[PDB]
Design a protein around this ligand. Structure first.
Ligand SMILES: OC[C@H]1O[C@@H](S[C@@H]2O[C@H](CO)[C@H](O)[C@H](n3cc(-c4cccc(F)c4)nn3)[C@H]2O)[C@H](O)[C@@H](O)[C@H]1O
Length: 138
């Protein structure tokens, strides 16, 4: 497995048609996972599965600018399962990140950070065994 937290450079930033694939296994009794598409210190897109928020499971998405979090977008559809292998695919589209988990569409996140070519790192953290992190163009 790979080290966690893991930093995946995204050379020259992201661009529409870029596909990022994360393979991993959720730890048993996991509490949280996070993917962070970063533009310097800013987080353009924070994708944050929470396994126990008030005994509910929820995915929280947000953007961090100048060290401040913005308005959260929440998705109650929750495809992750403690102890089980997953695939997260993030397709960059002109106006949003499109996220699918285990080949099922999950959510879209409108670009708040609009300088896409400056979003040049993906951080992966939380309660997973990380198997692979890669990107390609489709
Ligand atoms: O400040 C008050 C608010 O707190 C947040 S909680 C906060 O949410 C942020 C996204 O918006 C990040 O997820 C942040 N976060 C999460 C992580 C993190 C770090 C490691 C692993 C891993 F999965 C996640 N780092 N920072 C988290 O602390 C509540 O959602 C909101 O309702 C309100 O109470």
């Amino acid at each position: 497995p790979l080290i966690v937290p893991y930093n995946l450079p995204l050379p020259g930033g992201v661009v529409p048609r870029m596909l990022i694939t994360i393979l991993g296994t959720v730890k048993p009794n996991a509490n949280r996972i996070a993917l962070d598409f970063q533009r310097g210190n800013d987080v353009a897109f924070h994708f944050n599965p929470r396994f126990n928020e008030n005994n509910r499971r929820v995915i929280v998405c947000n953007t961090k600018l100048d060290n401040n979090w913005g308005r959260e977008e929440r998705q109650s559809v929750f495809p992750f399962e403690s102890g089980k292998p997953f695939k997260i695919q993030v397709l960059v589209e002109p106006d949003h990140f499109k996220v699918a988990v285990n080949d099922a569409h999950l959510l879209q996140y409108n670009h708040r950070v609009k300088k896409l070519n400056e979003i040049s790192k993906l951080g992966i953290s939380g309660d997973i065994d990380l198997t692979s992190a890669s990107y390609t163009m489709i």
